[PDB]
Write a protein that binds this DNA or RNA. Structure first.
Lengths: 465, 478
DNA sequence: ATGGATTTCCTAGGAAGACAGA
DNA sequence: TCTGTCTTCCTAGGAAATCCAT
């Protein structure tokens, strides 16, 4: 946060300057070594803060806060390159160290090579024969003024995880890296990228990346940048699996790693925070999941039936448990079910969810426990465990019993929204607990268009018995 | 019959043989006679070919077709056999001088051959760019040439209407013209054709892109021994570049396939035609496209006449001697509406094709009826009597019109919002009609639970898979 | 033979850029 | 300058080959 150290650096440059002008009528002039050392300190710090920005970008993909801007980083790097410039310029004196110029040049080169970033990441789930965009940024672009004034060219090529550790073809891969004096930025934006074909080398688990290469002239520096890991797909059906992989990699990944290694097993609450974040960001609400939801999720993925939330907390979940092992009694993985719920809730249940009308994540046994002691016509809404992306009405009605209504798909809710569907059922009197349905659903109801012209409108209603 | 005519020519050939071997121990004018009878026969066969093409022309709109070329091929083969035997008998000197005899024989041969090159499988008459289509060309005298012989290759090229009177390019346009001993056929089949782009020819007032007629030209060369070039032209087709154009393109083709003379300058068609011709075309297209033999009735033709002509006349005989123009058909917007006559009609075709197909055949749908005649009919009928009519305001929709008298009983008519094909996909017409308690009788009196009992779908009881209770949706009106 | 992955193929249709309009 | 024609761009699925496996 403190640039004060920089104000120590340039001032030290001042000291060197005046000292040089003192010998204008051998000496030390040891301050150059000193100052250069503090420069390497500054550079290292800015480099690791860059790496921080990168991991923040990584987390942003799953649904987490991001800076997002690089302008401060750019200003810092610019200042460091400034002091570098005046130092190197000051080296020009009669007062002969190969180390001064040699070290300064490696400071410059590491700063430059690390200032080559992927500002706009390509899609982390990528379909072949579909067009996507990516954006690369150079922070020290306006410091090279341009002195050559001739733009380097950045090429983008697809690489496997193996080639990442140091085929498939992409089109319109060459774009010039250009300086923009307004906007203060040195960027290259690939806006018409397309993948013609890829070598596959469990399909939705192979991590690939886009490699942005360039050449930079001064006085021969090769610039390399690697995008976030991405999963290549060839049809929409694979998407639902691909996300999981990406979801796993964007979180749970250390800042420095061999591309692209990630833990096979992780703490359960880490997974809970990941699910909460992804849920809130993807659906688009600030009303996240609750501890009970995490409990009923926990039993679901673990095939357990404990009613104490803390036993699960010290459990660990593996990638296999997450998206490679089939749930008991069912035909899908945990993740597939969860993502199905994500889709349904995003498209048709966002207002309903934010209003807290949906209990959602509950075993129907806890539902029995709750509803059995309730008056006739009390109901609650639960996500269906049998099918993917479905929601079911559970209500209590000869004695007292409870009825589970066939789950609504996104299609079903598109035909008639959940709200008016609920309005249709007069047998439903109160939303759990003890809340009148006609108050908490007045906004979701749509006003009748009775009357023209010149036809009477025919409406569709849901009924069950 | 035509075969008596064939064996008379051939018997004359026998006589020619015996006469020749008699005069080898002078006319011999009988050869001209026989030649005269051959050219007659050839002409007839040619005209029968011209018939087939026209049937094919009609077939594209939806009319019966009898598709094999094998009989025609048999005719042509026997005929060229006769040609060969005449030409062969000509080589007696002579007669013991006349070049003209063989000269006529050779034109018999060449006209027959060039006319034996047909487009058996027609390309789509509505053609989308960058979409794959197929075409099939046939040579009838193919199994005669060759019996050893290098098979020719047929080239397919796109041509405008102007070039037909004598321009995008196609991919994989070369295919060898091959003989097949089984099937007894000499055909060339283009199975991977593609139009990359098209350049649209003309000034376009008042025309529309989608009104411009193009064709595929099939060319070949034949090496016998003598230099005969084979060209065949397909039916006119309209090239499109997006689905929105289809419903208009079709109209053009519909107009062009009918109303076209058997021999014509490509591709001229009458701009105006008798109304009853239009009725026959509309009925045929309806039956073929929907897929029923239950065609239109005089009342339907009356309300259609009123619609397209803007004539509130109630006499079927007035319209009978009227003429309808292309402009009225698909270039003039209907009064009060945003679409042409044809667009509405095609909407109805689509609706009836996808849904209401069984319903129409059961004669449950009157369909083409003015709301005035509806009012006339329904006012007197009992409470809850209804009928189903196609919406004139909307495209591809059908509406229930029913009457409520009450105990007073002042009878008014209630017109229910038209059902789209989508709406019927959500819940069938049958189940929709069942859902409303009020509708008691189909017109005139037929009980609703009798005339729709086959169309009803069985209700599922709340048993559960599952275990769960099913929720179904029903239609209601208020 | 069923079924589950994986991929090239096809298709309608929305959205929006490009093209004229005596 | 604009509107309606025309066109190009682009894409979420549906039908269905290839191939593989305690």
């Amino acid at each position: 946060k403190f640039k004060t150290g920089l104000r120590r650096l340039q001032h030290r440059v001042g000291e060197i300057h005046l000292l040089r002008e003192a010998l204008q009528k051998e000496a030390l002039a040891m301050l150059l070594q000193e100052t250069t050392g503090e420069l390497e300190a500054a550079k290292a710090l800015v480099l690791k803060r860059i790496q921080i920005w990168k991991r923040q970008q990584q987390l942003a993909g799953n649904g987490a806060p991001f800076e997002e801007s690089l302008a401060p980083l750019q200003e810092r790097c610019e200042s460091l390159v400034d002091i570098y410039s005046q130092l190197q310029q000051e080296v020009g004196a009669a007062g002969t160290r190969a180390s001064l110029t040699g070290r300064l040049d490696e400071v410059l080169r590491t700063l430059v090579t690390s200032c080559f970033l992927v500002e706009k990441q390509p899609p982390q789930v990528l379909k072949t024969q579909t067009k996507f965009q990516a954006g690369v940024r150079f922070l020290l672009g306006l410091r090279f003024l341009g002195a050559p004034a001739k733009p380097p060219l950045v090429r983008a090529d697809m690489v496997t995880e193996k080639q990442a550790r140091e085929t498939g073809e992409i089109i319109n891969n060459t774009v010039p890296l250009e300086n923009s004096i307004p906007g203060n930025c040195c960027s290259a934006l690939f806006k018409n990228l397309l993948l013609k074909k890829i070598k596959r080398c469990s399909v939705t688990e192979e991590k690939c990346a886009v490699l942005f290469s360039a050449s930079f002239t001064l006085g021969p520096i090769q610039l390399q940048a690697l995008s976030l890991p991405l999963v290549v797909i060839v049809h929409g059906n694979q998407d639902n699996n691909a996300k999981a992989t990406i979801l796993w990699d964007n979180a749970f990944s250390e800042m420095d790693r061999v591309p692209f290694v990630v833990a096979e097993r992780v703490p359960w609450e880490k997974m809970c925070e990941t699910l909460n974040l992804k849920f809130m960001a993807e659906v688009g609400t600030n009303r996240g999941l609750l501890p009970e939801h995490f409990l009923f999720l926990a039993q679901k993925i673990f095939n357990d039936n404990s009613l104490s939330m803390e036993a699960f907390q010290h459990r660990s979940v593996s990638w296999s448990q997450f998206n490679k092992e089939i749930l008991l009694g069912r035909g899908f993985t945990f993740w597939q079910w969860f993502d199905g719920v994500l889709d349904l809730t995003k498209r048709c249940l966002r207002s309903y969810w934010s209003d807290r009308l949906i209990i959602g994540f509950i075993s129907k046994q806890y539902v029995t426990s709750l509803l059995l002691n309730e008056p006739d016509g009390t109901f609650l809404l639960r996500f269906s465990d049998s099918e993917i992306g479905g929601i079911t009405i559970a209500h209590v009605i000869g004695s007292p019993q409870i009825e589970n209504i066939q789950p609504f798909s996104a299609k079903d809710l598109s035909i008639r929204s959940l709200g008016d569907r609920i309005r249709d059922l007069a047998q439903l009197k109160n939303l759990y607990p003890k809340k009148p349905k006609d108050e908490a659903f007045r906004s979701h109801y749509k006003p009748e268009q009775m009357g023209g012209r010149g036809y009477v409108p025919a409406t569709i209603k849901m009924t069950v018995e």
